[PDB]
Design a protein around this ligand. Structure first.
Ligand code: HEM
Ligand code: HEM
Ligand SMILES: Cc1cc(N)nc2cc(-c3ccc(OCc4ccccn4)c(CN)c3)ccc12
Ligand SMILES: Cc1cc(N)nc2cc(-c3ccc(OCc4ccccn4)c(CN)c3)ccc12
Ligand SMILES: C[C@H](O)[C@H](O)[C@H]1CNc2nc(N)[nH]c(=O)c2N1
Ligand SMILES: C[C@H](O)[C@H](O)[C@H]1CNc2nc(N)[nH]c(=O)c2N1
Ligand SMILES: [Zn+2]
Lengths: 416, 411
């Protein structure tokens, strides 16, 4: 593998040099003869063996002591020996609080698909490894929601529940995000609410949830502790900050009855640190406007509102070459940013966010020797080429600590 | 192994077997993906015969006569020729097959539903830049067809020793000049400031306007390049106006109807065709987003947003996004009103999805570069954004080559 790789920005001519790729530890899915860079995702009994765990832990511990400028120190060699004994006697080990915080921040720093990583070192880490029950998980999650929401001055945070042991005692949040809206398939084939969440909604209903059957119903939490069957909990509604969507010019936009929640909090990913696996680790930041205004609202398989907005805008919808879809899409994203800013709920537009990411990427190249980035995900879903990331070459590779995908828990759970 | 690609909007899953036929590299490895790198980085008789044999085999497999008498005789024929000349010449049928398949295999091209409808002009008998100019004029006239554009490619003689290359020095046959001003800024098209200066330095008298059609700069058989003015009645242009903003025409904008890329290399069966201008018709965003609104291109967003009286102090007003849509409405409206072929990015990406379906069914796959296929605006409200794609390299192909003014040893 070549030692220095160059990436160029075709708009500014800036050339950056990447050496950090030499530290990559996992597979991308690509080969020498095929590129899988647009593939979205390129056994539960199996946990890391002693022999697998030793090198992964040393690699992380080494990285941690190098970061605090104590590599090779007495404290470094003693921590190595203590970890090695734990793995020897118990087949696993426990991270120190300092290492847990370092690992979580670096999984975010390493998340190649995240345009928001300029913030990676300002992450509030909540240590929930003492949790034993689903009620306890509910408590930790409510506190997380309240802290991160901060009455609209959102603060990035992660809550980390106990790590995997034998694979039969996993902690899991069954929700894909802490706050999402229910979706309901009707007998006639139409959908009320968010079509993305129909399957999960049906699971909640089977578990006993009584659905209000509206368009914007906050879903309950479905929480699994220690491998037990999951349990339902209603998030207290005063903890769910929401924004009604209105438009600065179009007085009729409010009459569409749209709203969205303030806190994006992904809850179905796995955090890997030093070979340890944290299967329940909900983390939250704040929104980029297009996540709501382009994807959530205008995806055909989501709320799919382009049609109705175009009608109320009295656009010619007969020919595609009028660009009526594009024109309505901009107005919708204007409304989303206006409504969040008016209510003083943190949000970032796609111009500001991508401009910050370029500055972040350049700094990471300077101080760290690189910045893994997934162009397919970094470039926003509208107006791609009038953001600076479109013209920026990126290298994608997988560093650890990392956030990973994991199978949906209803597909693997053994019901008690 | 068989590879699956999913459309996350329609849940259609296609199965790729065609990738198993590739042997050229992508630039990625198991540990690093270079899918967003623009260019991830003179044969011998021994390099040349396996390449020739592979291409002959796939041609005779394509015409349902694999292992036939003609197939066996063509292989032996090509064998003797590489032996005794260090190269070989393609039959006419093979030239046409190879050129259509280079287009078919172009992973970055969203227009490939048209790939088998390509007019192939054989220019392998050309010897001088005057001959190149004649062949190119005939291409332009045929492809333009009074607005009813027709896809075409003109293929000049192949590389021999690398010292006698035919080259079109222009990056496209029709482009507008760019002028580096005294006060530091740029008049015209900044993409072409360097090429324009080379044309001036070679004797071209520049009109110094905003849309000055560049001359052709043509190199035959490795000689110094020579300048030629394309006859203006051959250059079809469209004044851009808006269907609702009557002030838009006062911007003074125009563009040319014929996109004709002239700086790429065509590779067929180990042979290299360093001059092979090819042309189709525009997707509107190529003009309305990239050519007009790239920071390093015509950069007209501020001006348009001014005349729209948009609030420009905060990025979160999305004033850039509003002006961008209006510019692209004007381009599509202007070409359509003048009956010049153009396709919008919704229709084009929709056609590409259908093309992918066809290729998976009849060919076992379709190499496709998501980074290039997804249009530069309104990405996720086009169907290709939600379509998983596999990128891999098949030959015959179009390849990049160095700019001639970095190689050419003058005399
Ligand atoms: C603080 C403000 C943040 C912003 C503006 C932001 C922005 C984004 C956006 C726009 C995406 C693409 C999402 C999509 O297309 O649906 C994304 C993905 C991602 N973000 Fe960030 N993010 C933020 C905070 C965080 C935090 C706090 C973490 C973890 C601690 C994180 C980790 C990730 C990961 C792992 C992904 C990839 C998700 C996947 O592959 O499915 N982000 N982010
Ligand atoms: C007929 C209508 C066609 C349409 C609408 C079309 C559309 C496009 C577009 C939009 C691009 C991306 C260009 C950019 O972003 O700057 C592209 C790339 C490309 N097209 Fe097509 N195209 C057409 C015809 C053709 C033909 C006739 C050929 C060759 C015979 C061809 C070969 C290519 C190649 C090689 C590329 C990639 C260029 C590169 O890698 O730098 N296309 N096409
Ligand atoms: C912290 C934060 C802030 C912010 N503003 N946005 C964020 C977006 C994500 C995010 C996006 C897309 C995802 O996957 C879509 C998918 C996958 C497979 C199939 C269908 N769809 C997932 C999967 N967990 C997460 C994660 C964290 C974010
Ligand atoms: C046949 C046809 C029809 C149509 N409608 N559009 C077409 C666009 C291209 C096309 C686009 C971008 C390109 O690369 C930009 C670049 C590279 C390196 C450095 C700077 N810039 C090249 C490389 N020549 C070609 C090619 C053919 C087209
Ligand atoms: C097929 C394609 O990979 C898929 O639609 C991806 C494209 N890029 C994306 N980019 C972001 N940020 N989020 C997404 O969900 C997707 N979806
Ligand atoms: C850095 C990146 O590869 C570069 O900007 C690419 C991105 N995608 C593109 N897509 C198209 N269609 N045309 C382009 O010129 C580019 N440029
Ligand atoms: Zn790749």
């Amino acid at each position: 593998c070549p030692r220095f790789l160059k990436v160029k920005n075709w708009e500014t001519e800036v050339v950056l040099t990447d050496t950090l790729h030499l530290k990559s530890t996992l597979e991308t899915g690509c080969t020498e003869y095929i590129c899988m860079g647009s593939i979205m995702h390129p056994r539960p009994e199996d946990v890391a063996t002693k022999d697998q765990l030793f090198p992964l832990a040393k690699e992380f511990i080494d990285q941690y002591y190098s970061s605090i400028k104590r590599f090779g120190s007495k404290a470094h060699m003693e921590r190595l020996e203590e970890v090695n004994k734990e793995i020897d006697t118990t087949s696993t080990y426990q991270l120190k609080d300092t290492e847990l915080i370092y690992g979580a921040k670096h999984a975010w720093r390493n998340a190649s698909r995240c345009v928001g990583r300029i913030q990676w070192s300002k992450l509030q880490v909540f240590d929930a490894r003492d949790c034993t029950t689903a009620h306890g998980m509910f408590n930790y999650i409510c506190n997380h929601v309240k802290y991160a929401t901060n009455k609209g001055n959102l603060r990035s945070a992660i809550t980390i529940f106990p790590q995997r042991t034998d694979g039969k005692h996993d902690f899991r949040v069954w929700n894909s995000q802490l706050i999402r809206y229910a979706g309901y398939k009707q007998p006639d084939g139409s959908t009320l609410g968010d079509p993305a969440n129909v399957q999960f909604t049906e699971i909640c209903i089977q578990q006993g949830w009584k659905p209000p059957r509206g368009r914007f119903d906050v879903l309950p939490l479905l929480l699994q502790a220690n491998g037990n069957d999951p349990e339902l909990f209603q998030i207290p509604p005063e903890l769910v900050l929401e924004v009604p969507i209105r438009h600065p010019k179009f007085e009729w936009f409010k009459d569409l009855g749209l709203k969205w929640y303030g806190l994006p909090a992904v809850s179905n990913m796995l955090l890997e640190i030093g070979g340890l696996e944290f299967s329940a680790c909900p983390f939250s930041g704040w929104y980029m406007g297009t996540e709501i205004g382009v994807r959530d609202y205008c995806d055909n398989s989501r709320y799919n509102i382009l049609e109705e907005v175009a009608k109320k805008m009295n656009l010619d919808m007969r020919k595609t070459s009028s660009l009526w879809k594009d024109q309505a899409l901009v107005e919708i994203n204007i409304a989303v940013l206006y409504s969040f800013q008016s209510d003083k709920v943190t949000i970032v537009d796609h111009h500001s966010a991508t401009e910050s990411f370029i500055k972040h990427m350049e700094n990471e190249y300077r101080c760290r020797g690189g910045c893994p980035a997934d162009w397919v995900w970094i470039v926003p879903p509208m107006s791609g080429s009038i953001t600076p990331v479109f013209h920026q070459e990126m290298l994608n590779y997988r560093l650890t600590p990392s956030f990973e995908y994991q199978p949906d828990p209803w597909n693997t759970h053994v019901w008690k």
